[PDB]
């Protein structure tokens, strides 16, 4: 129902659309498609909505997030979240 995954830092080219990125396996286990919504968790939520992964992040468990996302919650590039269906 909720997974786990690292946060690493989005790509320039994802600046302030309010996207994250994960693939297949982080998907699947969440039960959402690219174009659904999730919410991010730490210490307080934030909504964002689903884009694919990039090749290379691909099965490293990664949840790629933009700095106005990771701002809110609070989190550094490597800390973990946690993310479900929202």
Do not use: C, F, T
Request: proline residues 5%; glycine residues 10%; positive net charge.
């Amino acid at each position: 129902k909720s997974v786990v995954a690292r946060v690493a830092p989005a790509h320039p080219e994802d600046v302030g659309k309010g996207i994250v990125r994960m693939d297949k396996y982080e998907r699947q286990n969440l039960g959402v498609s690219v174009g659904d919504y999730v919410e991010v968790k730490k210490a307080k939520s934030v909504v964002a909505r689903v884009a694919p992964a990039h090749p290379e992040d691909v099965g490293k468990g990664i949840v790629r997030m933009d700095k106005y996302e990771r701002q809110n919650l609070g989190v550094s590039v490597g800390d973990y979240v946690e993310v479900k269906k929202a």
